Amino acid sequence: APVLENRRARHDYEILETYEAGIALKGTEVKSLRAGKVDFTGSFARFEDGELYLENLYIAPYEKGSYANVDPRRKRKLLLHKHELRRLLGKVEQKGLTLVPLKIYFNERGYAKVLLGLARGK
RNA sequence: GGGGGUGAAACGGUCUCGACAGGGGUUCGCCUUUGGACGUGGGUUCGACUCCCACCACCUCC
């Protein structure tokens, strides 16, 4: 169930700020999440248009049996206010920073939320 | 091939804080409201992830 962070990142990049952003999941995705054999090995977030879609996040699809689910590595959108969103973007694509998946979990109100943060390292 | 069990740490009361769409409003700034994620389509409920309903999938029992 709940809280699973990205241990892959600490030794790779370094966080500047950290935002929290609800994600656009489907439902089975959510079940896969309530479990825990998904990985951020390689996953970061990117703005395809003006919206930010965390990508390469693999979420083992209802992998406690076998089921009739979805594309494990699907570009999942991210939610964040217009103001809270116009920022991070301007502090990034200069290719100096990177949107990397920090932690994942469900909030008080029961919603899976992702935690992102600026990055850089070598 | 039949039988049983499983499909959200609160055993009913949503607001995905946010993006994005669909409204109704607007001094075109913006305010307001609805959706969207809990395997799936179904109804039932003032309202449900949690109550029914099949159909699926896992596991399981002659």
PDB file of C-alpha atoms (C1' of nucleotides) in Angstrom:
ATOM      1  CA  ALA A   1       0.000   0.000   0.000  1.00  0.00           C
ATOM      2  CA  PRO A   2       0.941   3.813   0.463  1.00  0.00           C
ATOM      3  CA  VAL A   3       4.203   5.904   0.426  1.00  0.00           C
ATOM      4  CA  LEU A   4       6.951   4.914  -1.958  1.00  0.00           C
ATOM      5  CA  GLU A   5       9.801   7.238  -2.700  1.00  0.00           C
ATOM      6  CA  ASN A   6      12.529   7.283  -5.339  1.00  0.00           C
ATOM      7  CA  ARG A   7      15.792   6.011  -3.770  1.00  0.00           C
ATOM      8  CA  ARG A   8      17.282   6.195  -7.285  1.00  0.00           C
ATOM      9  CA  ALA A   9      17.524  10.014  -7.152  1.00  0.00           C
ATOM     10  CA  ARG A  10      19.400  10.974  -3.941  1.00  0.00           C
ATOM     11  CA  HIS A  11      22.756   9.817  -5.349  1.00  0.00           C
ATOM     12  CA  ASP A  12      21.939  11.057  -8.880  1.00  0.00           C
ATOM     13  CA  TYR A  13      20.635  14.678  -8.878  1.00  0.00           C
ATOM     14  CA  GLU A  14      19.950  17.203  -6.143  1.00  0.00           C
ATOM     15  CA  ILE A  15      16.681  18.948  -5.195  1.00  0.00           C
ATOM     16  CA  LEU A  16      16.233  22.729  -5.157  1.00  0.00           C
ATOM     17  CA  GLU A  17      12.484  23.154  -4.498  1.00  0.00           C
ATOM     18  CA  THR A  18       9.793  20.522  -4.151  1.00  0.00           C
ATOM     19  CA  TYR A  19       6.199  20.747  -5.304  1.00  0.00           C
ATOM     20  CA  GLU A  20       3.360  18.230  -4.823  1.00  0.00           C
ATOM     21  CA  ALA A  21       1.165  17.337  -7.758  1.00  0.00           C
ATOM     22  CA  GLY A  22      -1.885  15.162  -8.137  1.00  0.00           C
ATOM     23  CA  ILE A  23      -1.625  12.801 -11.126  1.00  0.00           C
ATOM     24  CA  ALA A  24      -4.049  11.780 -13.871  1.00  0.00           C
ATOM     25  CA  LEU A  25      -4.382   8.077 -13.171  1.00  0.00           C
ATOM     26  CA  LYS A  26      -6.967   5.627 -14.451  1.00  0.00           C
ATOM     27  CA  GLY A  27      -7.968   3.299 -11.628  1.00  0.00           C
ATOM     28  CA  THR A  28      -6.090   0.096 -12.279  1.00  0.00           C
ATOM     29  CA  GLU A  29      -2.998   2.304 -12.133  1.00  0.00           C
ATOM     30  CA  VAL A  30      -4.194   3.235  -8.706  1.00  0.00           C
ATOM     31  CA  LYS A  31      -4.515  -0.394  -7.709  1.00  0.00           C
ATOM     32  CA  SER A  32      -1.041  -1.102  -9.026  1.00  0.00           C
ATOM     33  CA  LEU A  33       0.095   1.771  -6.889  1.00  0.00           C
ATOM     34  CA  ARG A  34      -1.680   0.710  -3.731  1.00  0.00           C
ATOM     35  CA  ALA A  35       0.703  -2.237  -4.174  1.00  0.00           C
ATOM     36  CA  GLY A  36       4.396  -1.518  -4.905  1.00  0.00           C
ATOM     37  CA  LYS A  37       6.682  -2.972  -7.613  1.00  0.00           C
ATOM     38  CA  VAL A  38       6.703   0.147  -9.796  1.00  0.00           C
ATOM     39  CA  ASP A  39       9.855   2.161 -10.384  1.00  0.00           C
ATOM     40  CA  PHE A  40      11.153   5.601 -11.176  1.00  0.00           C
ATOM     41  CA  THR A  41      14.242   4.122 -12.739  1.00  0.00           C
ATOM     42  CA  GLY A  42      14.445   6.638 -15.587  1.00  0.00           C
ATOM     43  CA  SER A  43      11.169   8.487 -14.991  1.00  0.00           C
ATOM     44  CA  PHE A  44      11.080  12.312 -14.796  1.00  0.00           C
ATOM     45  CA  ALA A  45       8.483  14.912 -15.704  1.00  0.00           C
ATOM     46  CA  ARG A  46       8.196  16.891 -18.950  1.00  0.00           C
ATOM     47  CA  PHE A  47       6.028  19.657 -20.475  1.00  0.00           C
ATOM     48  CA  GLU A  48       4.769  18.402 -23.864  1.00  0.00           C
ATOM     49  CA  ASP A  49       2.749  21.541 -24.513  1.00  0.00           C
ATOM     50  CA  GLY A  50       2.170  23.854 -21.582  1.00  0.00           C
ATOM     51  CA  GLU A  51       0.999  20.971 -19.443  1.00  0.00           C
ATOM     52  CA  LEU A  52       3.380  18.673 -17.551  1.00  0.00           C
ATOM     53  CA  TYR A  53       3.209  14.919 -18.073  1.00  0.00           C
ATOM     54  CA  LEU A  54       5.426  12.800 -15.852  1.00  0.00           C
ATOM     55  CA  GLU A  55       6.879  10.124 -18.117  1.00  0.00           C
ATOM     56  CA  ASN A  56       8.622   6.751 -18.088  1.00  0.00           C
ATOM     57  CA  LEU A  57       7.091   5.911 -14.785  1.00  0.00           C
ATOM     58  CA  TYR A  58       6.539   2.191 -14.892  1.00  0.00           C
ATOM     59  CA  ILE A  59       3.575   0.973 -12.854  1.00  0.00           C
ATOM     60  CA  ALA A  60       3.316  -2.869 -12.875  1.00  0.00           C
ATOM     61  CA  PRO A  61      -0.374  -3.137 -13.999  1.00  0.00           C
ATOM     62  CA  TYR A  62      -2.451  -5.119 -11.460  1.00  0.00           C
ATOM     63  CA  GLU A  63       0.617  -7.417 -11.136  1.00  0.00           C
ATOM     64  CA  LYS A  64      -0.697  -9.651  -8.263  1.00  0.00           C
ATOM     65  CA  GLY A  65      -2.159 -12.035 -10.743  1.00  0.00           C
ATOM     66  CA  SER A  66      -2.679 -10.879 -14.246  1.00  0.00           C
ATOM     67  CA  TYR A  67      -5.393  -8.618 -15.442  1.00  0.00           C
ATOM     68  CA  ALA A  68      -6.783  -6.720 -18.481  1.00  0.00           C
ATOM     69  CA  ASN A  69      -5.080  -3.341 -17.848  1.00  0.00           C
ATOM     70  CA  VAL A  70      -3.046  -0.614 -19.491  1.00  0.00           C
ATOM     71  CA  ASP A  71       0.243   0.581 -20.873  1.00  0.00           C
ATOM     72  CA  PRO A  72       2.664   0.232 -17.967  1.00  0.00           C
ATOM     73  CA  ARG A  73       4.745   3.188 -19.060  1.00  0.00           C
ATOM     74  CA  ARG A  74       2.106   5.701 -20.051  1.00  0.00           C
ATOM     75  CA  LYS A  75       2.620   9.469 -20.158  1.00  0.00           C
ATOM     76  CA  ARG A  76       0.575  10.472 -17.142  1.00  0.00           C
ATOM     77  CA  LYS A  77      -0.353  14.119 -16.734  1.00  0.00           C
ATOM     78  CA  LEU A  78       0.253  16.099 -13.583  1.00  0.00           C
ATOM     79  CA  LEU A  79      -1.907  18.696 -11.893  1.00  0.00           C
ATOM     80  CA  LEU A  80      -0.693  21.974 -10.455  1.00  0.00           C
ATOM     81  CA  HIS A  81      -2.098  25.479 -10.527  1.00  0.00           C
ATOM     82  CA  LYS A  82      -1.443  27.848 -13.427  1.00  0.00           C
ATOM     83  CA  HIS A  83       0.725  30.011 -11.165  1.00  0.00           C
ATOM     84  CA  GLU A  84       2.381  27.090  -9.430  1.00  0.00           C
ATOM     85  CA  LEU A  85       3.017  25.670 -12.907  1.00  0.00           C
ATOM     86  CA  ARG A  86       4.275  28.651 -14.946  1.00  0.00           C
ATOM     87  CA  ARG A  87       7.163  28.793 -12.460  1.00  0.00           C
ATOM     88  CA  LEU A  88       8.967  25.447 -12.405  1.00  0.00           C
ATOM     89  CA  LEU A  89       8.890  25.466 -16.181  1.00  0.00           C
ATOM     90  CA  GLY A  90      10.795  28.753 -16.446  1.00  0.00           C
ATOM     91  CA  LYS A  91      13.334  27.469 -13.920  1.00  0.00           C
ATOM     92  CA  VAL A  92      13.882  24.374 -16.066  1.00  0.00           C
ATOM     93  CA  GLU A  93      13.992  23.556 -19.814  1.00  0.00           C
ATOM     94  CA  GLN A  94      17.058  25.848 -20.111  1.00  0.00           C
ATOM     95  CA  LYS A  95      18.349  22.259 -19.632  1.00  0.00           C
ATOM     96  CA  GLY A  96      19.897  23.283 -16.278  1.00  0.00           C
ATOM     97  CA  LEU A  97      17.185  21.650 -14.186  1.00  0.00           C
ATOM     98  CA  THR A  98      15.052  18.530 -14.387  1.00  0.00           C
ATOM     99  CA  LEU A  99      11.631  17.436 -13.104  1.00  0.00           C
ATOM    100  CA  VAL A 100      12.266  14.163 -11.316  1.00  0.00           C
ATOM    101  CA  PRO A 101       9.770  11.982  -9.381  1.00  0.00           C
ATOM    102  CA  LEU A 102      10.604  12.314  -5.650  1.00  0.00           C
ATOM    103  CA  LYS A 103       7.914  10.488  -3.649  1.00  0.00           C
ATOM    104  CA  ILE A 104       4.474   8.961  -4.287  1.00  0.00           C
ATOM    105  CA  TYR A 105       1.508   8.292  -2.079  1.00  0.00           C
ATOM    106  CA  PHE A 106      -2.163   8.987  -1.307  1.00  0.00           C
ATOM    107  CA  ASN A 107      -3.126  12.070   0.759  1.00  0.00           C
ATOM    108  CA  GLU A 108      -5.500  12.637   3.687  1.00  0.00           C
ATOM    109  CA  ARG A 109      -8.446  12.769   1.247  1.00  0.00           C
ATOM    110  CA  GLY A 110      -7.270   9.425  -0.263  1.00  0.00           C
ATOM    111  CA  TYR A 111      -5.698  10.728  -3.507  1.00  0.00           C
ATOM    112  CA  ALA A 112      -2.468   9.484  -4.970  1.00  0.00           C
ATOM    113  CA  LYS A 113      -0.199  12.503  -5.225  1.00  0.00           C
ATOM    114  CA  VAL A 114       3.319  12.779  -6.655  1.00  0.00           C
ATOM    115  CA  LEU A 115       6.183  14.864  -5.284  1.00  0.00           C
ATOM    116  CA  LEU A 116       8.586  16.486  -7.773  1.00  0.00           C
ATOM    117  CA  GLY A 117      11.698  18.688  -7.499  1.00  0.00           C
ATOM    118  CA  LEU A 118      14.357  20.557  -9.485  1.00  0.00           C
ATOM    119  CA  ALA A 119      17.512  18.549 -10.266  1.00  0.00           C
ATOM    120  CA  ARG A 120      21.234  18.609 -11.240  1.00  0.00           C
ATOM    121  CA  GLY A 121      24.373  16.706 -10.102  1.00  0.00           C
ATOM    122  CA  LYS A 122      27.765  16.045 -11.900  1.00  0.00           C
TER     123      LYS A 122
ATOM    124  C1'   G B   1     -16.678 -28.709 -15.542  1.00  0.00           C
ATOM    125  C1'   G B   2     -19.114 -27.199 -11.108  1.00  0.00           C
ATOM    126  C1'   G B   3     -18.445 -24.748  -5.434  1.00  0.00           C
ATOM    127  C1'   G B   4     -15.947 -20.727  -2.295  1.00  0.00           C
ATOM    128  C1'   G B   5     -12.911 -16.550  -1.714  1.00  0.00           C
ATOM    129  C1'   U B   6     -10.574 -11.551  -3.614  1.00  0.00           C
ATOM    130  C1'   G B   7     -11.094  -6.361  -6.955  1.00  0.00           C
ATOM    131  C1'   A B   8      -8.573   1.127  -1.390  1.00  0.00           C
ATOM    132  C1'   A B   9      -5.811   1.409   6.854  1.00  0.00           C
ATOM    133  C1'   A B  10     -11.125   4.137   8.787  1.00  0.00           C
ATOM    134  C1'   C B  11     -16.380  -0.583   8.101  1.00  0.00           C
ATOM    135  C1'   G B  12     -21.351   5.986   3.372  1.00  0.00           C
ATOM    136  C1'   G B  13     -21.557  11.343   2.430  1.00  0.00           C
ATOM    137  C1'   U B  14     -15.853  14.254  -2.572  1.00  0.00           C
ATOM    138  C1'   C B  15     -13.181  18.932  -2.969  1.00  0.00           C
ATOM    139  C1'   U B  16      -8.348  15.094  -7.775  1.00  0.00           C
ATOM    140  C1'   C B  17      -5.510  22.290  -3.957  1.00  0.00           C
ATOM    141  C1'   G B  18      -3.909  22.574  -9.104  1.00  0.00           C
ATOM    142  C1'   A B  19      -3.979  20.606 -15.016  1.00  0.00           C
ATOM    143  C1'   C B  20      -7.447  19.611 -18.937  1.00  0.00           C
ATOM    144  C1'   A B  21     -12.706  19.483 -20.781  1.00  0.00           C
ATOM    145  C1'   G B  22     -18.130  20.321 -20.480  1.00  0.00           C
ATOM    146  C1'   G B  23     -21.380  24.291 -18.378  1.00  0.00           C
ATOM    147  C1'   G B  24     -23.970  29.005 -16.377  1.00  0.00           C
ATOM    148  C1'   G B  25     -21.733  34.368 -15.548  1.00  0.00           C
ATOM    149  C1'   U B  26     -18.996  38.136 -16.479  1.00  0.00           C
ATOM    150  C1'   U B  27     -17.023  45.349 -15.753  1.00  0.00           C
ATOM    151  C1'   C B  28     -13.149  40.274 -21.971  1.00  0.00           C
ATOM    152  C1'   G B  29     -10.030  40.537 -15.647  1.00  0.00           C
ATOM    153  C1'   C B  30     -11.966  36.999 -13.665  1.00  0.00           C
ATOM    154  C1'   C B  31     -15.768  34.594 -10.198  1.00  0.00           C
ATOM    155  C1'   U B  32     -18.932  30.177 -10.128  1.00  0.00           C
ATOM    156  C1'   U B  33     -20.237  24.991 -10.875  1.00  0.00           C
ATOM    157  C1'   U B  34     -19.501  19.662 -13.156  1.00  0.00           C
ATOM    158  C1'   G B  35     -16.235  15.681 -14.785  1.00  0.00           C
ATOM    159  C1'   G B  36     -11.839  13.031 -14.143  1.00  0.00           C
ATOM    160  C1'   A B  37      -8.623   7.468 -11.077  1.00  0.00           C
ATOM    161  C1'   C B  38     -10.090   3.378  -8.033  1.00  0.00           C
ATOM    162  C1'   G B  39     -10.760  -4.231 -12.696  1.00  0.00           C
ATOM    163  C1'   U B  40     -15.740  -3.012 -16.137  1.00  0.00           C
ATOM    164  C1'   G B  41     -19.853  -1.830 -17.876  1.00  0.00           C
ATOM    165  C1'   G B  42     -24.646  -1.802 -15.579  1.00  0.00           C
ATOM    166  C1'   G B  43     -28.880  -0.180 -11.762  1.00  0.00           C
ATOM    167  C1'   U B  44     -30.245   0.776  -6.691  1.00  0.00           C
ATOM    168  C1'   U B  45     -28.941   5.416  -3.043  1.00  0.00           C
ATOM    169  C1'   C B  46     -30.660  12.283  -1.594  1.00  0.00           C
ATOM    170  C1'   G B  47     -25.398  10.607  -2.486  1.00  0.00           C
ATOM    171  C1'   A B  48     -21.252   4.922  -2.709  1.00  0.00           C
ATOM    172  C1'   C B  49     -14.231   2.624  -3.582  1.00  0.00           C
ATOM    173  C1'   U B  50     -16.764   0.697  -0.625  1.00  0.00           C
ATOM    174  C1'   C B  51     -24.762  -1.985  -0.833  1.00  0.00           C
ATOM    175  C1'   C B  52     -26.637  -4.836  -5.257  1.00  0.00           C
ATOM    176  C1'   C B  53     -25.932  -6.697 -10.230  1.00  0.00           C
ATOM    177  C1'   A B  54     -23.318  -9.653 -14.186  1.00  0.00           C
ATOM    178  C1'   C B  55     -19.646 -10.047 -16.871  1.00  0.00           C
ATOM    179  C1'   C B  56     -14.347 -10.372 -16.450  1.00  0.00           C
ATOM    180  C1'   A B  57      -9.167 -11.466 -13.808  1.00  0.00           C
ATOM    181  C1'   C B  58      -6.520 -13.654  -9.534  1.00  0.00           C
ATOM    182  C1'   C B  59      -6.565 -17.492  -6.107  1.00  0.00           C
ATOM    183  C1'   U B  60      -9.066 -21.645  -4.602  1.00  0.00           C
ATOM    184  C1'   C B  61     -12.245 -26.051  -3.326  1.00  0.00           C
ATOM    185  C1'   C B  62     -14.639 -32.259  -5.857  1.00  0.00           C
TER     186        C B  62
END
